[PDB]
């Protein structure tokens, strides 16, 4: 069972229900959906909401 209501479709950020018991994941502005179809990778130098300075 794969739906957005179950573990967010395993999407890191956003999930949309699609055809045939599948989901389509997506990300906020400045990120790209990764080749694994679930994760969100930066697509700009300083994407939103990320800590980049060494802590």
């Amino acid at each position: 069972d794969v739906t957005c209501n179950i573990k967010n479709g395993r999407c890191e950020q956003f999930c949309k229900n699609s055809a045939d018991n599948k989901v389509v994941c997506s990300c906020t502005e400045g990120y790209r959906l990764a080749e694994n179809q679930k994760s969100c990778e930066p697509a700009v130098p300083f994407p939103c909401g990320r800590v980049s300075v060494s802590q």
């Binding site: 890191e12 950020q13 956003f14 906020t28 502005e29 990120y31 969100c40 130098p45 300083f46 994407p47 939103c48 909401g49 990320r50 800590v51 980049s52 300075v53 802590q55």
Partner: protein, 234 residues
């Protein structure tokens, strides 16, 4: 922030501080290089504001601060301080010259209305600011941060004489001791989603900072996302 910790440099790179007649009087968050989101009770058309991004210690030059002038103030169209200084308590500030985004000056993410609400429902967010570190006490020099849990609606209604409408939420601890405070208003309440922070609230008010039985009151950002996105589109 009462009961918080010093942020490290670049730990909350979306945080800004506002300066006006009084310096460091409210917080805000970077929406994009030209727009800040804050509380409407902090600002007013005509009163000159400057924004400082990349700030950490307000008393030391750390070579990451970017100061910008505010050229337009957009309180939410439903804000009316004569009725209630704290309802629809949100405003946008347009900067004169864009910020230079970098590791110290980075926008906060803003999800759609549905997901901003889902993220608030996760039940744990971070607040940050240079406000008072004790009720009626001194303000912070170094940016403070604190994790606050969402408080269920019934508990928060039973804790105050004021009506808390559905476009607000409460957060804090049953024992008090950890809360936002005066001077933190307008700053962010953010939820971390797999290492990416999303804006889930605007710090608004409370009755007595960190007092046991009282909570911090926040503006639900989900109710205003469409308006933020429309107004700040570049």
């Amino acid at each position: 922030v009462v009961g918080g910790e010093d942020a490290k440099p670049g730990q909350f790179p979306w945080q800004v501080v506002l300066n006006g007649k009084v310096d460091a009087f409210c917080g805000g968050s970077i929406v994009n290089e030209k727009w800040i989101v804050t509380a409407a009770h902090c600002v007013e058309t005509g009163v000159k504001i400057t924004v400082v991004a990349g700030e950490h210690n307000i008393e030391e030059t750390e070579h990451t601060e970017q100061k910008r002038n505010v050229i337009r103030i957009i309180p939410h169209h439903n804000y009316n301080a004569a009725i209630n200084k704290y309802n629809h308590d949100i405003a946008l500030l347009e900067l004169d010259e864009p910020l230079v985004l970098n590791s110290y000056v980075t926008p906060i993410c803003i999800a759609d209305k549905e997901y901003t609400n889902i993220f608030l429902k996760f039940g744990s967010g971070y607040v940050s600011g240079w406000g008072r570190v004790f009720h009626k006490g001194a303000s912070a020099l170094v940016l403070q941060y604190l994790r606050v849990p969402l408080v269920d609606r019934a508990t928060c209604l039973r804790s105050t004489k004021f009506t808390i409408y559905n476009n607000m939420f409460c957060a804090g601890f049953h024992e008090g001791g950890r809360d936002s405070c005066q001077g933190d208003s307008g700053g962010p309440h953010v939820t971390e989603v797999e290492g990416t922070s999303f804006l889930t609230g605007i710090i608004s008010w409370g009755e007595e900072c960190a007092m046991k039985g009282k909570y911090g009151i926040y503006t639900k950002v989900s109710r205003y996302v469409n308006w933020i996105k429309e107004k700040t589109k570049l």
